[PDB]
């Protein structure tokens, strides 16, 4: 109903006459798809010097909270995330740690016949590892697969 000209007949000329008005996107160039279905993919850039896993847990929780409030017929999927790879690698490294510790136990028992002789160095191992973690905390060095 915006008026452009009086028209000197007291009949206003309005934008409806010369144009069609409709609410639409600013740009229609780009579209996103998840499988065949259409979707809007939002990319989350990790802040410089921030923990990836903790942020992901925070995001997933917040997105669940929002999912509780989603409009009817809306779902969220996180197809790609870097936290899954980190978790899998950390779990694999933990399994490798356990395997190495078991192998060291076997070698130690084989070489030193007595059980006590085997446990004594084996109980020396945890104190050293734990102290390493403690100094890592003092020095502010983040835990990486490199550290493990």
């Amino acid at each position: 109903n915006i008026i452009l000209r009086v028209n000197e007949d007291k009949s206003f000329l309005r934008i409806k006459d010369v144009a069609k008005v409709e609410i639409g996107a600013e740009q229609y160039n780009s579209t996103g798809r998840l499988n065949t279905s259409a979707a809007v993919p939002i990319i989350i850039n990790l802040q410089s010097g921030a923990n990836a896993v903790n942020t992901a847990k925070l995001i997933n929780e917040k997105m669940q909270e929002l999912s509780k409030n989603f409009p009817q017929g809306l779902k969220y999927q996180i197809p790609y995330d870097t936290t899954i790879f980190v978790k899998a690698s950390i779990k694999e490294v933990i399994k490798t740690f356990v395997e190495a510790l078991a192998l060291v136990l076997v070698v130690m028992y084989l070489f030193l016949k007595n059980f006590k002789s085997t446990i004594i160095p084996m109980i020396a191992v945890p104190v050293s590892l734990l102290g390493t973690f403690a100094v890592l905390y003092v020095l502010g060095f983040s835990i990486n697969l490199l550290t493990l």
Binding site: K20, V40, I42, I43, I44, I59, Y76, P79
Partner: protein, 148 residues
């Protein structure tokens, strides 16, 4: 709004590039100009704090603002600490297909994107496309000429 990439590069990137040149601990610098936008990425040594890097970049651009031709369009100028890594990608997809891409994008931007920006450890959360609601006015040249 609109322009050619060659002119934007030669006139805008070079005066800014020299201004940035000499910043503390910059491994390399690159600039890319596209129709309607210019992006200038500056990189720094691993030990350099990105916060102080941004401060020094702001200082240099302020000092060299004399040799700057970005004056034609001052609506948007941004200097942002950027992160190459993307923690994850979340696709918001509607099951019923009742809402089209524009509506989903607008709802996401209104509700979820802001809350994600707030979440700690998130440097940035953005959605592909710029399909925000906008009051598109479609002029009809035939009627526009008819009515004078």
């Amino acid at each position: 709004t609109g322009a050619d990439a060659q002119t934007i590069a030669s006139t805008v990137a070079t005066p800014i590039e020299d201004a940035i040149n000499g910043v503390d601990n910059m491994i390399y610098m690159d600039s890319t100009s596209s129709p309607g936008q210019m992006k200038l990425t500056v990189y720094f040594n691993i030990g350099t704090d990105p916060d102080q890097a941004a401060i020094d970049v702001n200082n240099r651009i302020s000092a060299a603002t004399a040799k700057l031709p970005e004056a034609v369009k001052k609506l948007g100028v941004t200097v942002r600490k950027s992160s190459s890594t993307i923690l994850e990608v979340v696709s918001v997809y509607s099951e019923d297909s009742s809402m089209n891409d524009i509506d989903i994008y607008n709802y996401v931007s209104l509700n979820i994107l802001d809350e994600l920006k707030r979440i700690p450890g998130v440097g940035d959360a953005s959605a592909i496309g710029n399909k925000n609601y906008s009051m598109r006015i479609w002029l009809e040249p035939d009627l526009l000429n008819k009515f004078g």
